[PDB]
Amino acid sequence: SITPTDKKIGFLGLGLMGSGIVSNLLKMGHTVTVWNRTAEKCDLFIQEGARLGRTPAEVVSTCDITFACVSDPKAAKDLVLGPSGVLQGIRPGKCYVDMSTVDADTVTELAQVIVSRGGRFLEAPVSGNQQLSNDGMLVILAAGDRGLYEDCSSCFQAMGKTSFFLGEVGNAAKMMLIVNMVQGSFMATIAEGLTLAQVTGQSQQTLLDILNQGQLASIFLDQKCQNILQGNFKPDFYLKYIQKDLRLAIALGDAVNHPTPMAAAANEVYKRAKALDQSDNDMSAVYRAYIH
Amino acid sequence: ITPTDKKIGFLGLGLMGSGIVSNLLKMGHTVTVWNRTAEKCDLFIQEGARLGRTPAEVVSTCDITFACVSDPKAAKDLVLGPSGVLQGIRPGKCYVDMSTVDADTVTELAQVIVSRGGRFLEAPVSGNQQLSNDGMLVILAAGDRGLYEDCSSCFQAMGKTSFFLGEVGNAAKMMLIVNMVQGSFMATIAEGLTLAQVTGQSQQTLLDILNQGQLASIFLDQKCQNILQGNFKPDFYLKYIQKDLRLAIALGDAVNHPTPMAAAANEVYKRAKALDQSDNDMSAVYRAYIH
Amino acid sequence: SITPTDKKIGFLGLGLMGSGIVSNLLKMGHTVTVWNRTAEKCDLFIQEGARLGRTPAEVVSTCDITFACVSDPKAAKDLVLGPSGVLQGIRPGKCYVDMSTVDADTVTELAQVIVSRGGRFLEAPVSGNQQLSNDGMLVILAAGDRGLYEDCSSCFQAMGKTSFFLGEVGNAAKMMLIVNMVQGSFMATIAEGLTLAQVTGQSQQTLLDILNQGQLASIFLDQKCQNILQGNFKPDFYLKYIQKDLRLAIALGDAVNHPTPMAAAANEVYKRAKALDQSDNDMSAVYRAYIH
Amino acid sequence: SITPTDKKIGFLGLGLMGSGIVSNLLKMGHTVTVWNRTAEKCDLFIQEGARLGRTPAEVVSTCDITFACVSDPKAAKDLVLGPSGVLQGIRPGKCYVDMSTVDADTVTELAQVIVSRGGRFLEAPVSGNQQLSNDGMLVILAAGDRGLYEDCSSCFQAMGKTSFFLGEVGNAAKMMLIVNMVQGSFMATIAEGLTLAQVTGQSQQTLLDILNQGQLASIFLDQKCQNILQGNFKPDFYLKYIQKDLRLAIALGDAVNHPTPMAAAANEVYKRAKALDQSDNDMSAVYRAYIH
């Protein structure tokens, strides 16, 4: 039972992940000011005891540590550099923790401008999904200002199962991209396997039973198969997110001349899925890219 | 479980067959063994097996004969070649092919064996050398249901569990899909660990993070530890996984179903074979990524 | 103007390619006996002066040189080894020229059985398309019995623009697969290019115009693009044939541990096209694998 | 023989392409001021009659139309926005023609800043290679300011075989990326074919001879094969440039949810070639990615 920090916490982006994080931060006794581009999404947290912030700039100005959890590099950059953005609220004292999954260049550029105005910066992307976020069981990958990482102890314990500190700014982005590349590629392979079973007159259910008896058995494999078997593609992690992470993972490899053919093939299947309107369903809807 | 009265034959004392036979003998079966190379049989005579001279004669001597060889080419040769399984079949004899082959091969072999009064069951196995030694294989069977039931004590000895998947052909198709998934995942894991290496990240830390995530599995952990220790001693030969990928793609071809993930994994494994990794563990595909 | 051989010529398989070959053989004054699994296809050559054969065995028994031109390895093997097949008509002296595109193992196995019964064997797969076949402008790739190659001079000159002799049985199969791999992969690339242009608001027509001004300009590129632009996918070379050739080319690489990723990718796109019912259209119908 | 424009012409970037362009501009009687980040590359051009500019800003300030031909989006952006860059020299009326191959977002961002200072902007990327640039036989793809395109008539005729005007800014970038995607993918395929031939005991020379008798015969196919057969990988078009164009083409497809699996595959082979130190050889050096 860790006791919560005195520090006034701000939170920007009440999305699929952010929403669960904030809940758990409030459950565990933190003082939190929330903001979201769409005001309506804040209502449920105001009810759980959050303060409603008017802009990112003002949230940062009011709070000691501000977390942000948005979708893209484009969104992360806009949140910081746009009008009434984070940067406008930064002064010596203020700390910003970016939990968005972006590329290392984005995180480096953002850390630089923030530090240039007297701020402190930590990247802390998260590995998990809506359910894990709601349950407060995310795996947190952090890099940057070590002191700030230690200040976020109670926060990371509320939102998370465990936390890794990976050194200098850039490293958490690089690792998160690799973790998600593995996840996204495996999902493509699972969907390829289930649809091959279907089409060759084999039982998908029996394929899953066999796989669960083997060495490859995992919570992920079982859960994503069950989704497909039930026809349930309600998003636990958005397909568009995983395709983004694959795209960026491939770019990381490009940057160091390292072929990533498995990721490259996965990416093209996910692009097909997006062309078939699956962007806002679960990543498991890549299954629809294989359907005849 | 009490072992069957039936005289059991076993052909092919390879990576998988060797463990199966050991477990059959441990659990009290009467077993006659044969292997193209005679020397591999010596340990098994010491563990109580009878030495068979030819596949034909083992089949002729035994009630149920299991075979476990590498390829479709080897499975076909073992049955159709001189002193092969077919020459020993007569009304009532039973053959259980545990090799991983394509559906056409298993169909062709079933048909010739049945045509001479034999009974046929396909029972490919999912696992590796260690699981085979431990008697913890997952068995996928298809064909003659009565023969499946007769193999009860044998399957319980060699296996953790068993599936019966219906008509001949279905176990082949399923096994290829299972292995396609495994093979493609291994290519992805290798791609992930090498990308970590080359980008200044810790491979060990990558594994630690993956082990805290939802993707944590015995397979993931074991195969990563192999790579991290530089240990590519074969638990499942790389050449076998590339064979299975090749056949899984051929299965898809037959029903016009693209398998691009498999296709990509297959080319990586082909590269590994060109770098002389065929007789190492499937995890040696890691070497196809090394700069 | 080359004077036609005395030899009685047989021809098995009056398909997309075979039909034009036979026409040109008759135009140039050869005595030809034709056979086709479907008897009705042989009618067209009655007025052109062909004799109608009843079975492959009988055609081979009657003729000095018998050409075959069928679709797959399966078909080539069945034509030889099935009931009243080519093998049953072979006796010392008889000559068989297989013009089907198959793998080297198939041609090797077929050559061996035919020679075992006193026959002579040449493989002479053809590069071209229905139009070139009709015009007598095929490129012929031959391997095997050199004497038989020289005996086919007048036939090859009738049906072909030019001919290559590539040595021992197996070599023409291997070369033909590589030629078709290149062609099939290129066609996938062209379709990828035209569809990307469409979807990004560029003019397909102008893409072609630019390509025709560059160093890549070829009859093939122009012709297949004009098909796509006109929506005309009437078969000049069946899509299913090109996918078969890609499949086999990948198998050839497999056999010598040589990755063929470009072919592997092309092959998966062609399989998609087949799932979308394009098997019997032109290979350019792979375009429909890209359509949103 | 067209009469050269009165206008003072500036040229930035005397690389593989720029060098030939400038030589032809001078041959055809234009007044040209040249600049290059490395000063020494300008020396030949003073002999051939060019004025030596000190900075990009100053060249733009001195000239009526300034052409730029640099490697990357990163280089194009730095050339314009860096210290003493193009932007610092722009004033109402001045014209900039960017001939670098970049993505549409880069060309858009650059056109906007230049126009914001009263400049006029045209994108005019070029299709060809060092030899065609030297011969003045490039294909020019232009988009943006139509008036400026017409003012460049003498320049484009000196440096080019032909020119296309594709409309609004962005369109030339998109088209160029597609053209290069096709070229780059095809080169990968050709390399795959020649190496497969090698490894399976066939003659690469004979493969080329057969292809030259077929419908796929092109200057490109012949030239790139002859390079490989002679072991001559001296750059006509840098491999790094073709891999950049493939990467950007794939990014273009990402942007509109269009899978480009052929490009994706080619890109991974080129990345392997870069990992084998082939970046500064001809694009045909992708051959070395296949060598056992």
Ligand SMILES: Nc1ncnc2c1ncn2[C@@H]1O[C@H](COP(=O)(O)OP(=O)(O)OC[C@H]2OC[C@H](O)[C@@H]2O)[C@@H](O)[C@H]1OP(=O)(O)O
């Ligand atoms: N033509 C022929 N005729 C008779 N026997 C032959 C023939 N070819 C190989 N073999 C035998 O099969 C065994 C090869 O299997 P191994 O490489 O150990 O691999 P595993 O046991 O790991 O593989 C078993 C299956 O499970 C999975 C995998 O995909 C396989 O299908 C070995 O005992 C061989 O005899 P030898 O005399 O010792 O060389």
Ligand SMILES: Nc1ncnc2c1ncn2[C@@H]1O[C@H](COP(=O)(O)OP(=O)(O)OC[C@H]2OC[C@H](O)[C@@H]2O)[C@@H](O)[C@H]1OP(=O)(O)O
């Ligand atoms: N940051 C920066 N600032 C100023 N100048 C720079 C910069 N970076 C590179 N460059 C210059 O770009 C030129 C590139 O030359 P080259 O490699 O021969 O390329 P090519 O002519 O072969 O290719 C040109 C384009 O055509 C198509 C292709 O895709 C390319 O986009 C070269 O003269 C460089 O100057 P340097 O001092 O000589 O090194």
Ligand SMILES: [K+]
């Ligand atoms: K927690």
Ligand SMILES: [K+]
């Ligand atoms: K057991």
Ligand SMILES: [K+]
């Ligand atoms: K002719």
Ligand SMILES: [K+]
């Ligand atoms: K010119």
